[PDB]
């Protein structure tokens, strides 16, 4: 069904890469390759808040 002027669909995926691990890509079509990835470290005491309150 046409959503936002588009009869097609795109599904977005994600994963995590361990240190010293290789990730491989292989396709003959229909691949939207990553360009900008992210390196991160977990804090502990953080979360997500849904609000309209000003900052």
């Amino acid at each position: 069904p046409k959503v936002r002027d588009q009869e097609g669909r795109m599904n977005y995926y994600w994963t995590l890469v361990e240190p010293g691990d290789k990730i491989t890509f292989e396709a003959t079509g229909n691949l939207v390759v990553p360009r900008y990835a992210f390196a991160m470290e977990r804090n502990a005491g953080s979360g997500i808040i849904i609000s309209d309150t000003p900052v």
């Binding site: 502990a44 005491g45 979360g47 997500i48």
Partner: protein, 175 residues
């Protein structure tokens, strides 16, 4: 209340007594005035601080868990999460309200007991040498100077020392 002294046989408080929770008011030839009883007030302050500590010290602040998000095919675990959140909230809300109510009743009774115990200590000492005139007040059958007054507020009052005096005045109105 539970011990009959506060709002009981001692009808009201002393606004003019600002330096303590319990104590005495005296009146003799030297002078008058309110004076706090250190021992009862000091112990009671320790007890209430212990009581408040025993409630709040173990209520350490904690890190609240992340508010979970679920999709349309996760209603069962969404409801389970809602059941968990609601279950804990009801218990803490009900217990905290009920605990404070029960604790507050004991706090007032504790103050009532300390007044009654303080009154009994004085009554146990004076015996026939003074007349119980109600409202927690004693009228002496003998002259009690400032030095004599502190002996009553100490547990030292010498009944035989004023007995011969107080006996004569007692039987004088008794006859």
């Amino acid at each position: 209340g539970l011990f009959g002294a506060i709002a009981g046989f001692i009808e009201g408080g002393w606004t003019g007594m600002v330096d303590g929770w319990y104590g005495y008011h005296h009146q003799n030839e030297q002078g008058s005035g309110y004076a706090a009883d250190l021992k009862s007030t000091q112990n009671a302050i320790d007890g209430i601080t212990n009581k408040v500590n025993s409630v709040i010290e173990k209520m350490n602040t904690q890190f609240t868990a992340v508010g979970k998000e679920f999709n349309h095919l996760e209603k069962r675990i969404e409801n389970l999460n809602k059941k968990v959140d609601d279950g804990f909230l009801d218990i803490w809300t009900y217990n905290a309200e009920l605990l404070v109510l029960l604790e507050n009743e004991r706090t007032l009774d504790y103050h009532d007991s300390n007044v009654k115990n303080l009154y009994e200590k004085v009554r146990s000492q004076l015996k026939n040498n003074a007349k119980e005139i109600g409202n927690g007040c004693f009228e002496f059958y003998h002259k009690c100077d400032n030095t004599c007054m502190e002996s009553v507020k100490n547990g030292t009052y010498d009944y035989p020392k004023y007995s011969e005096e107080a006996k004569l005045n007692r039987e004088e109105i008794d006859s």
